[PDB]
Design a protein around this ligand. Structure first.
Ligand SMILES: O=C(O)CCCC[C@@H]1SC[C@@H]2NC(=O)N[C@@H]21
Ligand SMILES: O=C(O)CCCC[C@@H]1SC[C@@H]2NC(=O)N[C@@H]21
Ligand SMILES: O=C(O)CCCC[C@@H]1SC[C@@H]2NC(=O)N[C@@H]21
Ligand SMILES: O=C(O)CCCC[C@@H]1SC[C@@H]2NC(=O)N[C@@H]21
Lengths: 123, 123, 123, 123
């Protein structure tokens, strides 16, 4: 149910696009495009999901990472999204994220932004 | 420098073990073993790192995910670590993490733990 | 504008109630009632807000704390909300929060939940 | 034990100073001085702590807020620290924090930094 539900195109609350394949082994592979920040076009993502989730109505735990380097830009930063997939007619991936920039040691205290993204199958 | 510095075995501040290969393409692949929580033995990890970091003394941004399912246990949860690699004689990976459990919608507000891990090359 | 806008009753996305007075000195004082977790009735809150915010269209930074002890219950925990007030016809307080429980040292790694609350003037 | 243990001067891992009084009613009052960021001299803090903590060896949950406005500077930002006090010969306040800046709606996704501070009675 989770494998067959996660694979595809997802859209966050504004204008970012998350394209993912959920493998039978628990792998997440695809691309991410952010409409905000120091980013242009698609970036590689990889992650993991629970490939045997509970059947009690609980969501499916997952996470993925994007390092913000591609052929066009390098922001010297990486975001991880940690969350859960919720199935049904209004399917959702509800996440919180951590965006860490490469910094000097003196600036390390301010290296990491935190936020949240909600993904849907329709933009 | 970052590719040649990240690959290997890392140990957190207590008793967890992070085994990773940093690929030329920006990939992180390996295994994680936690000495705490609902976990036993090794779990698959995958992630991304900045494969062309700044040369100004800044750290190398990275992140990875573990879904807490293996052949022994399934915690129905996933952790993402977001952080930076700092090179030199006392090499470090400094991270913050988000641990999301699969929950019901009613319990989603309490789905996610936050913390921090510091990894070194010596335990 | 911020002082005259923050004072009053606020409601989160589900069923919690945030009653606050914004003082001229930057103080936040009031009570919080949560409809979830180990909580019953009202709890004291105190916090701070920027009493001279920017006039460029930016929000007003603020934060507050609740320790989850009152005359009825003690959860041995505390939540801090950090966020910004956004004025106008659809006024909002957009927050992220950290909920720390008192733990043993062995369990400290799992002491802290993270989430987000959006408050409006209408439930 | 917690009331008699929290009151006083605390120092973080680098060069910040946290001066606090823990009241019998659960109040935290005092001043904070940061050696980093857009900050100079002392700022008002207020917070809450569990004034009847568990006696089983668990820490004492607490939190506080600083809005980064004083007579010298206004950063248009606020930090909340959420954590626990650990008593004994090497007393500690272990915290995680959220630093929210006032932003435009377009920039709200990057409003909030996350980190951690460990406070001791000796610098
Ligand atoms: O500016 C950077 O360092 C790289 C781009 C970051 C974009 C962030 S990732 C979290 C949030 N969700 C999005 O879709 N975009 C932003
Ligand atoms: O209990 C679970 O849900 C699975 C195990 C979680 C272990 C966590 S991940 C973050 C922290 N760092 C570690 O090395 N272990 C804990
Ligand atoms: O269970 C506890 O430890 C005390 C109650 C916690 C309620 C939390 S605080 C963050 C979130 N927002 C709410 O309104 N309620 C929950
Ligand atoms: O730059 C600002 O917006 C105001 C100063 C922020 C200082 C932060 S608060 C968290 C961390 N701990 C400290 O002692 N200082 C920094």
């Amino acid at each position: 149910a989770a494998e067959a539900g996660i694979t595809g195109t997802w859209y966050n609350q504004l204008c970012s696009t998350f394209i993912v394949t959920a493998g039978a082994d628990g792998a997440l592979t695809g691309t991410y495009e952010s409409c905000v920040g120091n980013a242009e076009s698609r970036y590689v993502l990889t992650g993991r999901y629970d490939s045997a989730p509970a059947t009690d109505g609980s969501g499916t735990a997952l996470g993925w990472t994007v390092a913000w380097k591609n052929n066009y830009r390098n922001a010297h930063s990486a975001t991880t999204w940690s969350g859960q997939y919720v199935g049904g007619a209004e399917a959702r991936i509800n996440t919180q994220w951590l965006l860490t920039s490469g910094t000097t040691e003196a600036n390390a205290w301010k290296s990491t932004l935190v936020g949240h993204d909600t993904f849907t199958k329709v933009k």
